[PDB]
Design a protein around this ligand. Sequence first.
Ligand SMILES: *[C@@H]1O[C@H](CO)[C@@H](O[C@@H]2O[C@H](CO)[C@@H](O[C@@H]3O[C@H](CO)[C@@H](O)[C@H](O[C@H]4O[C@H](CO)[C@@H](O)[C@H](O)[C@@H]4O)[C@@H]3O)[C@H](O)[C@H]2NC(C)=O)[C@H](O)[C@H]1NC(C)=O
Ligand SMILES: *[C@@H]1O[C@H](CO)[C@@H](O[C@@H]2O[C@H](CO)[C@@H](O)[C@H](O)[C@H]2NC(C)=O)[C@H](O)[C@H]1NC(C)=O
Ligand SMILES: *[C@@H]1O[C@H](CO)[C@@H](O[C@@H]2O[C@H](CO)[C@@H](O)[C@H](O)[C@H]2NC(C)=O)[C@H](O)[C@H]1NC(C)=O
Ligand code: CUO
Ligand code: CUO
Ligand code: CUO
Lengths: 211, 182, 825, 50, 366, 210
Amino acid sequence: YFIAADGTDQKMKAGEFYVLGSENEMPWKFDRPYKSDITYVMDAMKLHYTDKYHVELRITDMTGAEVTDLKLVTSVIYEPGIGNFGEGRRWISPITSASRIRKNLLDFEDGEMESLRNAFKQMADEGRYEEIASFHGVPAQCPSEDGTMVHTCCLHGMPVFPHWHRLYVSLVEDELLARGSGVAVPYWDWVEPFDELPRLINEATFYNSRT
Amino acid sequence: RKLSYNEANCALPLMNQPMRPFSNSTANNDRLTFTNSRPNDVFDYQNVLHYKYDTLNFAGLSIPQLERILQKNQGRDRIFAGFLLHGIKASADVRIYICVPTGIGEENCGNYAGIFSVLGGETEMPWQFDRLFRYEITDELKKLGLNQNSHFRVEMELTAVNGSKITQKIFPNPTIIFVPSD
Amino acid sequence: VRGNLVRKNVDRLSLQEINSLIHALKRMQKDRSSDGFETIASFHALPPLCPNPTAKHRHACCLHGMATFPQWHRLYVVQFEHSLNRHGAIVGVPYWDWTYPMTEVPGLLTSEKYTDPFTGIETFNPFNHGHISFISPETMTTREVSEHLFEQPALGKQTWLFNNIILALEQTDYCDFEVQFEIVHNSIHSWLGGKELYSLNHLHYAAYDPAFFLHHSNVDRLWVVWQELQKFRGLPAYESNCAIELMSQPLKPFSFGAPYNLNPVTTKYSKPSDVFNYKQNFHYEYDMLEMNGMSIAQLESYIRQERQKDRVFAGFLLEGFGSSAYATFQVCPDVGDCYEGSHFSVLGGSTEMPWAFDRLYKMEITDILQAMALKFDSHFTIKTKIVAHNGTELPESLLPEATIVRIPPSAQNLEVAIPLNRIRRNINSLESRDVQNLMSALKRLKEDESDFGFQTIAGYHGSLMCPTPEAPEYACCLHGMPTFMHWHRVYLLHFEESMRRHGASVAVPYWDWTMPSDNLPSLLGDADYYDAWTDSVIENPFLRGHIKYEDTYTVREIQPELFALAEGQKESTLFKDVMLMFEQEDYCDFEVQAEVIHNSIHYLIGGHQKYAMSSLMFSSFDPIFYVHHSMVDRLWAIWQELQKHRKLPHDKAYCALDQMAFPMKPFIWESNPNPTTRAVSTPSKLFDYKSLGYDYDHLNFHGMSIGQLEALIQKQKKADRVFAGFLLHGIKISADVHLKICIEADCQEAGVIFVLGGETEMPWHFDRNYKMDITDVLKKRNIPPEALFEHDSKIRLEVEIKSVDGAVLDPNSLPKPSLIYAPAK
Amino acid sequence: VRGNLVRKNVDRLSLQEINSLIHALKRMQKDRSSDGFETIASFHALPPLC
Amino acid sequence: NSLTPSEIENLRNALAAVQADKTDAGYQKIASFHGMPLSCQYPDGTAFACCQHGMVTFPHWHRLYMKQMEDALKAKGAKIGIPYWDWTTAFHSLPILVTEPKNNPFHHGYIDVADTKTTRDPRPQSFFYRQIAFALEQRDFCDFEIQFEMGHNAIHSWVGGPSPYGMSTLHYTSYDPLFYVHHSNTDRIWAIWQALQKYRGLPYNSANCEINKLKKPMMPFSSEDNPNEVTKAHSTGYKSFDYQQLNYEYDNLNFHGMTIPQLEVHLKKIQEKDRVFAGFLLRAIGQSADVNFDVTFGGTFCVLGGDYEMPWAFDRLFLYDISKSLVHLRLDAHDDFDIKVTIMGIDGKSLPPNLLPSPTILFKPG
Amino acid sequence: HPLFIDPTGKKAKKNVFYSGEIKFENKVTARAVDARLYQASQEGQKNFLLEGVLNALEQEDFCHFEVQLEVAHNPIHYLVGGRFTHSMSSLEYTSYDPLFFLHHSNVERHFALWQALQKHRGLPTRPNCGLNLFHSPMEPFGRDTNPFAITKDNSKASSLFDYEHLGYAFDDLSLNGMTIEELEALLKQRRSGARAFANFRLGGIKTSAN
Ligand SMILES: *[C@@H]1O[C@H](CO)[C@@H](O[C@@H]2O[C@H](CO)[C@@H](O[C@@H]3O[C@H](CO)[C@@H](O)[C@H](O[C@H]4O[C@H](CO)[C@@H](O)[C@H](O)[C@@H]4O)[C@@H]3O)[C@H](O)[C@H]2NC(C)=O)[C@H](O)[C@H]1NC(C)=O
Ligand SMILES: *[C@@H]1O[C@H](CO)[C@@H](O[C@@H]2O[C@H](CO)[C@@H](O)[C@H](O)[C@H]2NC(C)=O)[C@H](O)[C@H]1NC(C)=O
Ligand SMILES: *[C@@H]1O[C@H](CO)[C@@H](O[C@@H]2O[C@H](CO)[C@@H](O)[C@H](O)[C@H]2NC(C)=O)[C@H](O)[C@H]1NC(C)=O
Ligand code: CUO
Ligand code: CUO
Ligand code: CUO
């Protein structure tokens, strides 16, 4: 079965299935539809589920010759995510493809800190992290539109401010884990009042147990 | 709240242009950030950037408890100061003072209400917030026994990160907003 | 004590009233006092006095591009008002409202000369123009009229001002109101002023043109309307919660008690906070607080309906520059073709006090995006070109590039004042006049030989005419599938239109067969009636339809069981069947239950006959068809309401998206009488009935509110139930399936289900099985559901299907039932 | 409880009001029932019933 | 829940059956004991209400009382035991059997003494879960009971509301079919605990505090005029601990989704985080009232009581965790706080003030 | 109803009884029923139809029976026909409506009942009233073109006093479940007492009237 639009008209195969049959097989018909998800090919066509798409299929027997004709496929169901806490779902923390856990800096342990330090030191020893800071920093890499002038690349006036830095913290963490970090980049909550700065960043030196 | 979370109803034409340092083939060679450089790509962090936070509760409050607090906050009469901000070529601290008129003659001023910061650098990309930033001055007015109806004005004192060259009248005068309780 | 002055509409002014106005202005124009015209015109802008009259450097006086703009100009009009009232005007300052579409500039504004009817002397019309004293005695204001002033409503389109005036009046926040409001007002300044230097488009000289004060009399009126709206909404009308800071700073030059302002009242209320209560302070009234003839009530309704739509806006951030200019923005997709978006204007001069809006000025582009066939999150941009008064194109760098914001629909109930003739009512509630109106209308329609006629529309269902004529080899009706409801909804719509076309002031009634009925309701039952207006006796048009190509009238052989199905009264089988349908929280699950019951009634009123309601091919020719289909449609509306009451989807459904997109077959074709049913051929569009222009009075099942329905629905889910499942499909004929449960070889009737069909059918297969609970039947035989799982006793279901023409009876071509156990959650 | 009908001045009518008026009278002019134009017109004079 | 028809089916008839025996009680005598009509006498023979709440022997009396009631459906197709509904598990609505308006024996009872059927007025993570779990946490029996009784009567407060004829009142509660069914559950909770102990090697069919009182016999179950031999046999305190010789069984003593062993892990798991509790002294008062806490909301809990009830005072404090309150105010058990309370009567009024003294406020690590 | 449902599905046929077609001039005869015809109401109006024939059944002359029978038979024609010109309401077209004959089978059945009652005891069943009108063959039955000989032979009113030879019989001819002796009991004991009557002098007014 393929999905076709009215426009091009261009098609994309949505997969196949086999139904088993013989000459004297038991009379049978489903009281339920066989569902195949077909969601990927839909997004691949840049085709929203509302635009007119008629569903088309071709059927073959075991030999080469084509069989005609059928079949009722007039139903294309839309399955909403279980997580969006919508009309049909109660509030449930959605299960996601999430690898790394970022945790509170205060909840860190003696080992997890030394792990994070050594991993980042390696990132600092090699020329890497300064290169990442330079995405945001003062050497300007952003000269548009003509360009008269070059600007710092980070976006601060926009509503897409969080998006930019959401990506920044992602980039540094991804490179940090590859440098063997035991944990993802932690958040430290300034929202909780403190008389001093965190262990991790405050003191100029730490005792390294390995060396 | 049943609202948009992985999408934005707000300023749309910004959401499809890829982040300029990340979208650039150089120097971003990390394929992860490169492909997902467009603002809409990075909305659900978990599925795309494969990370999570241990708990998404704030100050020890589960999210239902959070919205409960937030709703109680809206349950009372509150008063705000409106700030129209934009790109200076330097970062600065602006402090809020509540100016109270003295009976005879007219007079003023200084009572410390709050502080907030604006960030910047000489070569930053220019910008202008198209809505007011709000600061709740409600409790400070209460300590002055003041009201939304009572006579007063709000003055900002711009101290930049120089420590010196205390800045002078960069932003429109603070607006005063009153939100009555529901 | 004198009594308030009334600000009349211009065209309403009488010859006496115009006269006193024209002579009064004549004097205050010649008046060199500070009560005079040149002097008051000085208050606004160019001969500046505003920082204070003594300043070395001065700016323009009036407030513009800030929250207190309405207040300043309110007080500025009463300044001009009090002058000419003391100069002998019997009325307040007239307005010309742009709320109504414009065909022309008002007479007292446009005609250069005026003749006094009473003294017969032709003189120069004082309102035609104004003199600018300081420039030269020989210097007058001049005007240029843009055709953008005279726009009239199109098919779907509406005039710029109308859309944008409502857009302002929609706002609930004063500052959000003010920003939208001012720019709406800016339009006339540009449209009457034009590119002329001494005009209304120049901030400097605008007040020197006398039209300024008539125009702003309306600007003031709009604020009073918005003020009135806020009172209606239970909001602060006479106070402003935003920009509180500005409501203290007094209005110049009005604030000067000393020689510059002689008005005692204007000085006293120079504070913008005091400018609010116009009737008590400044003593003036309006004749009518109306937007284009709408009451403030009608206004808010329109407003709330528009808030239900899915809308998207172009946002503009405006910072002020002298001089005045107008902006044009276009909506441009990724492909090169650009479409024209709307346009707006700013008012400015060189001496203006610098101004910046702290919010976005919104423009609606939602109607334009739909024309461009792309949604809100699709790739599209906005290019803006702004030309000055001068007028050279001003750099795109001058104003920040536009933003775009989509506001989601707000799902909540509305009034909504629906035309009396377009509501569908319970057939037993109809008064004698509705009955007579319907009958006269139906007789004419059946007599109609045009395509609008009864034969033609009845031919849409049971034919023989599905695409493409003449290929079929097909029948053209939609069942059984989710799109079944939809098709018959347009069909019923199509019927309602034809009714109205012959003078029906009554929408198609619904007959409630779920209530106990001893016989068919009289409107449908009576054979003939005596007209008084004609001495003739004529037969009820609802009784039978004539089938033209078959040369036979419809027949109604009523099974005694039809009445017996609902004799509960609340224990009635029909009640139980429908409540089980209402429980469904999926649209497709709702549909099968809905249509099976629909087939039940079809069968029982015209049973065991060809050319009857029971036979699918000819049922539409019997007039009660539509009345029945009014009922099933209402049932769906109740479900939609039930669905909206639960958080579940009401306006759309996630089912057969393959069908919902494509529009339906008999209606689309170019050979269709009315264009309206053609427009709504798509199933997606008829999902909500209100948008189609009709409504049911009322929406409740038996004596229960919707909340009470869900309560009784939940209660049924709190008990254990046992269903029999029926996968159904199209046999080439109508049939009744009798269900018997057998505890042993002894069998008793468990229930019955009906099937619609005809020789010319559209082959149909259901998506799931229709359900019917025999739980109460089981409880009657004292076989608790545990025994269903027991090997002994042995129990079975037997089905005897009988053809529409008895018996015949048919060997079993329908799948055998299934036992489904639903434990309470 | 249904709000009072307003008798407006003719020249004051908006396009929406004019339109709904045109279509109403058009139907009631075609309405052959007693609530139609012809029958209501009779109440005044010539086809007499008094 | 999980009932299979006609399992439901048999019972109504049985409940129907005893609605009038009505000789033995038949049901009204069986009702009186918790209910209003006077159970017993001081030696001066003055009216008492032979209700045995407020004391440590609280469960036995009831757990029995179910029995008396339970026996009463005897061979009337009393084919299974009185069911229990786990009020711990959060619930949008009340349970059917006692809801169905028509032809249902569980809707209401009648009262010869008042000429009326019962009236009930319900009033608005799961609160009871948190409240019960604590009770389970405890290891002393006495410590357990105070929480066990208070968790319990929270429902007699909320099911009944403001009707004298109702579950909120001591006087006529016992009359409403809802009452036993709530019980099975209360009893079940107790049983679970016993299993808990047993798991922990603490005494379960015994109890070291107080030796005083378990030995006092219990009327009416004492009384000669109780024509059931069994209850009298265990009329005592110390008997009635082993419910095994009753003889009944609960389908499963598992708190929702937990093996007993699973349960201790849970509690053990809870116990990690340091908590903070408030404990009140509660003591007899004729009326029945609900009490609402404050510092944000800290509330709440209810006390069951009626006219002519034996007076009682708890030996120990009643604890209610208020940690969520502190986080709410962001306090550290360090910053110091005012614990403000309120105490409404079941009838519309009137929140009279203590009465109860002052709440102590105590901290548990951790 | 205007349509007859045959047990066989088939096609519907205009049921012959609803409307008789008037072939000369042009069709048809519908009927505007008057409300008086239906008296199922709780007490009132009283059954005036019954009282009508009940009043004729009491009279023991033929003349008196005849005038009271004929008047009592008019309500049906009037109330069924109603304002409509072509119907039972006028004697000009009433015979074209099939209900006419279903109506007159009853009034003849009443006539039989009366002769039975006179025969009960002990009075003539003969018309002693219109002797001269009895000797002429009543048109158009005595007409030369009569399809049936049985009516042409009995076309004289003289030979129509009895109906046994006319080849028909009624199943009951007892109004409202009353024995011939039960009816006579009511009749005879409605005769007992002081009475008062509205005396009407009637004749043709060239129209039907109430
Ligand atoms: C995508 O990124 C690439 C690089 O990742 C970027 O190209 C870079 O552009 C910058 C900006 O011009 C180049 O910057 C150089 O920086 C050094 C100092 O670090 C300077 O010596 C150079 O010029 C300086 O002096 C000039 C006067 O003599 C000044 O006018 C100028 O502003 C500097 O101060 C020089 O600018 C850098 O070499 C490139 N690198 C590469 C690899 O191209 C590119 O612009 C980005 N593309 C887009 C579309 O954003
Ligand atoms: C630090 O002080 C300097 C002045 O010595 C400020 O510099 C000027 O700032 C204004 C804007 O306020 C600019 O228009 C001038 O071009 C700046 N001149 C120079 C030489 O920098 C600077 O703004 C201050 N920065 C901070 C953070 O206060
Ligand atoms: C027409 O108008 C524009 C602006 O009104 C004039 O240019 C402005 O000149 C001032 C300096 O006096 C600048 O500050 C503005 O930036 C200029 N314009 C804009 C739009 O920003 C222009 O010179 C005029 N040209 C004509 C038609 O005479
Ligand atoms: O700096 Cu750009 O991010 Cu905080
Ligand atoms: O307001 Cu001053 O301009 Cu129309
Ligand atoms: O009409 Cu298509 O079936 Cu009811």
